[PDB]
Amino acid sequence: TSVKPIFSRDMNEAKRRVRELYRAWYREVPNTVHLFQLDISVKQGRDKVREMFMKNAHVTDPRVVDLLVIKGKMELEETINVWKQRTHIMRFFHETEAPRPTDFLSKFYVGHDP
């Protein structure tokens, strides 16, 4: 069934837009670290950008990819315009949450979670 495309027509143009947004985020991490006075490294920021891009690597719908890059542009322009604070930028890193157990034995020990 034919559907109205948000952008990108097929998957190739969606991948192109993903690459453009990835370049935009990659060239912004030094500025983000400088302006927000982050105690993280530039390499850490670039790795976090790569990780956040990689968790959506299983998407096979061009419209979902277009919406994802739209929201990525939104949260990039929040970082560039310093609308965000260091609070949110470091919320990206989950620096205060305790490491959740992942093995069956530990999960059995701690509680009733699946």
Partner: protein, 208 residues
């Protein structure tokens, strides 16, 4: 006299019905349905891509000068294929009337931005996007308006939890506010209030 029953206005009902027929005749390509509620409110259901032509007609037509955009919101009905229902409320000062125009969309289908018809549509559509996830194609500045920076999810959706997924506190170790998964000292006690006896026979649906 019936002091406890709202009086009705057949004159206004007939006028609204006539104008609904008028607009439906003028715009057959987009108008799907026309209704007049028993408390005299005209409601127009159109195709989602007729938003700009229908709104421009209702604004600029001599016999329909709805020069004011009273409101613009959406309603989430998950049981429908197109869960989101965009609603426009227009006010015509020249004829002292109000009209409602309703369209539909889902998560992955954009709706044309009506900032070229009404300037209030800018912030109204920003709020619609922020609270439901509906994308508006040609919007001068489409971004979050009400939620926190970096907030994930659209909270007015029916499937979004009332308390969300994260909560904020100040952590002394990191010397900043932190966001952590929501944890409630007292859980919101959900109540089942609906009576198992039908209240309004006029609205009874066929068993099907």
């Amino acid at each position: 006299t019936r002091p406890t029953i709202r009086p009705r206005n057949d004159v206004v009902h007939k006028q609204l019905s006539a104008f609904g027929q008028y607009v439906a005749e003028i715009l057959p390509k987009y108008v799907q349905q026309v209704q007049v509620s028993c408390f005299n409110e005209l409601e127009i259901f159109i195709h989602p891509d007729g938003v700009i032509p229908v709104l421009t007609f209702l604004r600029d037509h001599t016999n329909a000068q709805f020069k004011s955009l009273a409101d613009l919101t959406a309603v989430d009905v998950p049981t429908r294929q197109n869960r989101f229902e965009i609603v426009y409320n227009l006010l015509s000062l020249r004829f002292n009337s109000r009209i409602r125009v309703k369209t539909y969309t889902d998560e992955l289908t954009p709706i044309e931005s009506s900032v070229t018809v009404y300037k209030a549509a800018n912030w109204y559509e920003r709020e619609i996007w922020d609270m439901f996830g509906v994308f508006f194609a040609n919007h001068p500045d489409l971004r979050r308006i009400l939620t926190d920076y970096g907030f994930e999810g659209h909270p007015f959706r029916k499937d979004f939890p009332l308390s969300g997924y994260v909560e904020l506190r100040y952590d002394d170790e990191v010397k900043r506010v932190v966001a952590e998964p929501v944890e409630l000292a007292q859980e919101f006690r959900k109540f089942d209030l609906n009576s198992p006896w039908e209240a309004f026979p006029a609205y009874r649906q066929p068993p099907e």
